[model samples]
Target: TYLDAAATTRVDQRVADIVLHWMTAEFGNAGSRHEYGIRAKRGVERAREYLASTVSAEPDELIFTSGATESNNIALLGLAPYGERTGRRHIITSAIEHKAVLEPLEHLAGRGFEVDFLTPGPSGRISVEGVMERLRPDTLLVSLMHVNNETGVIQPVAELAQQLRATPTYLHVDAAQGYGKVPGDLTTPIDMISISGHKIGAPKGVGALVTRRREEMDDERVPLEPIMFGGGQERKLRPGTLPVPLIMGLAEAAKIFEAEHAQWQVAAQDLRSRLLAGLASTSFQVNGDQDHVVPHILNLSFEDVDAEAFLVTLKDLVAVATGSASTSASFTPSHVLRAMGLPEEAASKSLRFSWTPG
Candidate 1:
């Protein structure tokens, strides 16, 4: 049934049409001079404003990037000097975060940053209160995902951000999976947020990193530098010629999701219900905190069934992802399930089923 939306959802035909129109009719460099460039630059500005408003941010605060992975890199690695220079190298994150967040944190850990990788139990969620208790006066940042890509478990990013904003520690949320799906969460104040377009209905290779200024520090921007260089666009952070077509498509896709979210949630949950009923005869268990999960993703284990084998058996009729799509090539066990205290057999035998709403 083509149930691997978390890997990357299908692009909407309407969004695709917008992308094509931008590519063919409005081909202009946003960085160039003259009428073509002016139109292109204005297009980017409008998209920036519209997209930022979706997340309750200002246009100046967000920068376009290749995707959430690259944005996560910039959010974590870009603040190297601020953390190091301030002698506040302690970072707090989850053990079950996407590799996009984990790998960058690992790189920081290698360079002497003290990172606390908090592991969730079988519930698949870490508490905001527990997170608050972990902060030292010298803690630099707390980066967590808004939603678990594999488990669909929602983190307390919005609630946590409220607590972090009053402190010196920067709060960064990788909102790849939750951005458009969970409507109210992103509006809450957070220092930085990463967004992925493809996870919704937009094309790949387009996303944004939002860096909000500290309200208490005379409104100074979040202390993040560039992991990349040149042109100095995107506030000297993401420097490159803006991909106008993709940007427009992302904005349009975001609009579609937000406007239809209520009905979309209903339909997505309906599909989940149907799927669960169809598999009633199968011995399986749903993983993660069901109460906190999003509507479109499911993580579960078939009793005594090998996930690798199940995928092979089901491949003729469906396309499903084993764990994280990036690491699933090896058919490896999920670090997410493992961190949630799942036994190796359970962790290795789990599969993620995701769907999209029409």
Candidate 2:
């Protein structure tokens, strides 16, 4: 009944059990200086180790945040000091990124950083050449999303990563929609990748930002200053008591998704195909690069139906959405469809349908 799984997925039963056990039984603070503290600390570290390894990061490279929004702020705004220090104050990013990444860069732009918002072609994909053509000598970072949350288009992050490593410009990817789904691509040399737990079957209020070192034997971490402070937790970058339950749930959920991804892909393809067949009589256009997209999500615009009205008509049978749940509070048009340079009517008539396997 829930087709809007792109916004968030329900937590897995087994993952729920893991979270509850940690919350109720092992409730010691990770920073407390005692036996119970060490146990809690060990639990957090083990989870961190698993997550860090998933992205091929050094164990000390990953840090927990409340979610991808916070992670984005930490990764984007956190790099401002470095830009100012080196006088490399230009940033390149696509216009289709989530507001989480956009707002932070907007903030940076307000503070004298020159920001260029790239526009993709009608395919809803940002090509590698488009990015390469826009790079400047003073470009400090290139922040692009792995898979679009609205159009489900996969960006050229991995291909761009290889190119970025050769320049001083760091690469940051907002991977909330692509992390577990496109697991193979995360192992690339991207400097910062942000993830959200609930999008991948873990509970909300938990996620991580991986700050990969420049290279092997370089020992140079991405320059980031703490945006929040108090406790000396998360390398003093993110300050707060560690959420052991959420962290453990994230680690387990990621591992489970990785293990079942092959089967999940088949189920997702079947579901997407069935839905497409069911809508065979309806005139619609999918708003993504089919060859480069993941299986579980779909974006489309109907020929004559207003998307808001269509959602209301199918409200009883399936839960659909117009755009990111975070910004779905009102009837504003999708920033993604607009940025894709489609007709104004197409942007207004677009809706999103995403699902889970089984």
Candidate 3:
């Protein structure tokens, strides 16, 4: 009945089973050096392993977190002063990213980091040429979301990553909406990738930041410094005791996605087509780069209708969102829509509906 997977997806039943075992019979602290602790520790490690393998990364390189917001914060702020003294003072990102990326960059600005917010084309895709044009000798990091949170537009991250590898810049990908849907090979030029388990049918409060395996071991190590300090868990980039059940759930969820992605894609496509047909009678315009959008999300704006009104009318029938759920409460309009040059009315009217098959 709910169609707002983009905001966060329902827990997959398979993952729920694994979580139940941990919560009941297998509960233990993953960091403890005991028998029960070892059991849960292996689960947490396996979850990291499963998730990292999905993108061809090493488990030790991945750090677990609360979700994409924390992941984004850690990815951006952790990299603060990231070689900034050595002429790497610039950060590049798209204007169409989630607040997780956008707001953190804004925060970085006050710290003397210069950020370049790239505008997307009318089709909602960031041109490789545009990104290349903005590259500089002082660019520190290039953070981009693999999929647009509102529009589901696919970004040319891999292409950009490859182009920036030779430079001082490090590539950080916010893959909250792309992981499990996009094909990301760690062997590619990308340096770090972020993902959310809740967005892909795992439990909430669990996500990952997968770092690439490189031949040369530099101090870069994802170029991130820990924001929170305590037990030095999660490689110290993210510190705290690990959530045993959540980690196991996230790992099992990744395994489920690995085994059934193809079938899920087919079923999801069917639902999308059906949903589109159902909307045929409505006066609306779909937003974003339709050709490159992932199959599970549909971003559209109702013509001449107030977006808030539309939500009020349909609230009970289905759960959905307008813009990033993180910024929904704000009175300000979406920067993503504005960057694409959508009119104020259309931008405010835009709504996002994302779904996943059970």
Candidate 4:
């Protein structure tokens, strides 16, 4: 069985059908003004509407990107202009964030931007107080992941955003792991959210960044500069030809999640309990905050068995990960576990098992 849904889930048949239709019969560049293009454009807008509604956002507030990595880059780097404009050179993010978010912040740091990386507690959780304590008058942005990829621990993004409401700091959330799995209300003080389609049964190479104008500022614009130049697409911030087929597929997947989230949660919880029960005979300890984790992911650290050996022995029986899918091949201790104060050996022995119910 495939238990590595954290990496990517299989695309739903309904989503696949829509994507195929767009790729074939409905084939047309969204930029074209001809009849075929108009049809494709209308379909794309409808899909945008579907996705925006799910998050209680306006369609115009959403911008299509290649995937979460691109979305995270856009949300972070796009703020460079704003930081320069307002003289806010400081930024804050957690050490446990995906490489997508962390790498961009690292780039900023290389450019002389002051970036503070808050370490997580033993629960694999970062508190709002930790963030509040580090907030500064010139802090330009604060980024946090909605759900940790390895431990599936839900962070206090909403609470953190609420705390930043009074400050000029922009709050951005990477929701790739939590978007469809956990309950989130983006209508709060959240400024930007990064979502990945592939993480929730949509095809790969499709994602979106949902952002709203900063009403608190004198300038109501999103205060982001274009990362690329082109035909003024995506509000001229992320310029590129929209991928219609992938966009449609992503919309369908969001619709399915909207309709079935509760049922999926219930089923996943039961299965997770069963999995834990099956492992009761083993000498293993769960990683991260157990009560704050999403039901679909379970990270276990085998006390005696080596993680590499365990995965090698069960390679044919199932698929999982030693850490985040992006870094599983490195054979290094998980940064997330290390941030939670896990010993190097325990961090190396941790395995992440995640799945979605059929």
Candidate 5:
């Protein structure tokens, strides 16, 4: 059991050691010109490059933020307006997206942007047609999550990106739950990709949005405007003093993941299979398309049993949440489940179990 990774994860001790070393020994403001500051800056910059390389992006293209929430904010808010200025203000997204994405779209809508919300398949897949049909001459962007946190269904960002190649659309993928867990480099020609460190075993509160060259999209060829004002740090796109230790830890964790990914995949699949086999006799129904899920996750509904009740009943034996821990405390059923055509009762009966390879 012990499966609530869709919400957060248990940090690795090795990664903790790396973070703590800087916290104690090299704790200094990266903005300062002192030796300690220089060391901290180097560590953060190196880590940033490492993390960015995992996704086939350059170091400068990576803009670190508080986490995926901020990353999404920068991508959706910062970029949506760019399209608006050009009279390209329509956005297309799916209903299954996390609040980080949904709320941003709503904000865009309030500001006069037209948004097309795609509905998922019965098994929770966002169809290519749904995305393709939504593309308009004024379509500014298409934001989609690379993986469903509740259902663990992978979105075909590569296919979708390829399909929209000729358009002026900015493809933004919330890869908070999928980065580093899936195999191979995410080499699709996406305009911007949102990534989180904790999802890849780094500490929370550290993530980044990787963008394509501004020259590639900008008419006058200037970098995108900074969303916030203050210290002109973080490429000016995100204005704040960066967290040196956390960012370094995230990069180091990503380095470890990239090197051990193949073995990690094998181990993850083995653990998922073990859990599935162990739960065979349990009264449960698997929630998404099994054929498309990442090995680190397995969502199942405890048939004839309420999910919240199941969580309470098994809390002593295992630590599991009904959905993303971020949303489990809510009164609403998971939007992901609802998108899959499940009734509120059935959706409320579902739970997600996520794990990493030992």
Candidate 6:
């Protein structure tokens, strides 16, 4: 069975058909001045509106990027100056963030910004009190992942955001793994949220970053600069020619997920329970906070089992991962596990098993 949905999901055939039709008879550049361009531009706009509405955001507040990596880069780097100009040089994030968020924060640190990396407890949980204790008036931004890619542990982004709503610090959530799988309303005071398409049944190389308008601020736009410059597309923030087909496909996937989330949640929970029960007789220990984890992901530490070798043994009948797909090639242990103060043996013995409703 293909249990590595966290690495990437199979694109839905309905979404694929929409992409194929666009690539064939409906092909057009969204920036040109012709009728085809107008139609293509309309499709892109409609997709933007649809995706925005899913998150309860306005159409103009969303910007499409290549994926979560780029979206994270743009969000962190673009906001660096807002901090610099306002004399806030401190930023806070958890230690278990994906490299997409961690790497950018590292770059910010190199650029002279002070960054605090909070370590989660042994249960792979970062408490709201832990985050609040570290916040300062000079804190410019707090970047956190909504769902742990390796552990499926859900962070209290909403709870943290609520506390920081009255403060000047901005909160950004990387929602790649939890976008449609986790049940929550993101329409509150969260400043920015990033999500990817490939993780949710759309094709790769397409994602969106939702920058909500701060109700207290007079300006509707989030303070950010263009990471890439060329055209005035994406409101000059993520300026580039739009991928109309991918955008439409992403929108379609969101619609499908929203329509069937309840059923999907039930099925995922059933599969997760079954998997856990199947391994009940084994000497495996669960990693992360099981009580707060998403239903689609199961992280287990097989006692005395070497994850690297286990993957080789199971490669024939299954597709699984030792950790986040981006860092799977590395010989190093998982950062998420290490952040939870997991012993090296447990970290190396762990594997992430993820699935979808299909």
For each candidate, the alpha-carbon lDDT, in order, equals 0.83, 0.83, 0.75, 0.81, 0.75, 0.80
Instruction: Estimate TM-scores for all models.
Output: 0.89, 0.89, 0.86, 0.89, 0.86, 0.89
What TM-score does prediction 5 earn?
A: 0.86
lDDT per residue, candidate 4, 1-358, as tens digits? 8553332335566777888888875554534557767777888899888887777778888888999999999999999888988899999999999999999999999997999988997899999899999999999999999999888899989888778877788899999988877756555658899999998889899999988766657636567887889788878877878688899899898898988888888877776776677566656677888889998877878758665756653452143322212212222247878888888877777777776675
Which lDDT tens digits does candidate 2 get at residues 223-281?
A: 89998889899999899885778999999999998888888788777666766665555
lDDT of 3 by residue, 161-242 (tens): 8787777678988988888777653346688888887877788888888766555655346657778888768887777775
Per-candidate clash tally = 0, 0, 1, 0, 0, 0
15: Cα error in model 3, Å = 0.4
The lDDT, on a scale of 0 to 1, for candidate 1 is 0.83
Q: Ten residues in a row with the worst lDDT in model 1? A: 321-330
> Which lDDT tens digits does candidate 6 get at residues 146-237?
99888889998889889988898899999999888764646656789998998888989899999988866996667998778999888888
Worst 10 residues of 2 by lDDT: 321-330
Error of 6 at 342 (Å): 0.9
Give the higher-lDDT candidate: 2 or 4. 2
**Model 3 ranges off by over 4 Å:** 1-9, 26-33, 185-187, 217-220, 305-333
RMSD of candidate 3 to the truth, in angstroms, is: 5.6
For the record, the alpha-carbon RMSD of candidate 6 to the native fold, in angstroms, is 5.3
lDDT-superior candidate, 1 or 4: 1
Error of 5 at 215 (Å): 6.2
Q: Candidate 3: lDDT over CA atoms? A: 0.75
What are the root-mean-square deviations of the candidates from the true structure over C-alphas? 5.3, 5.2, 5.6, 5.3, 5.5, 5.3
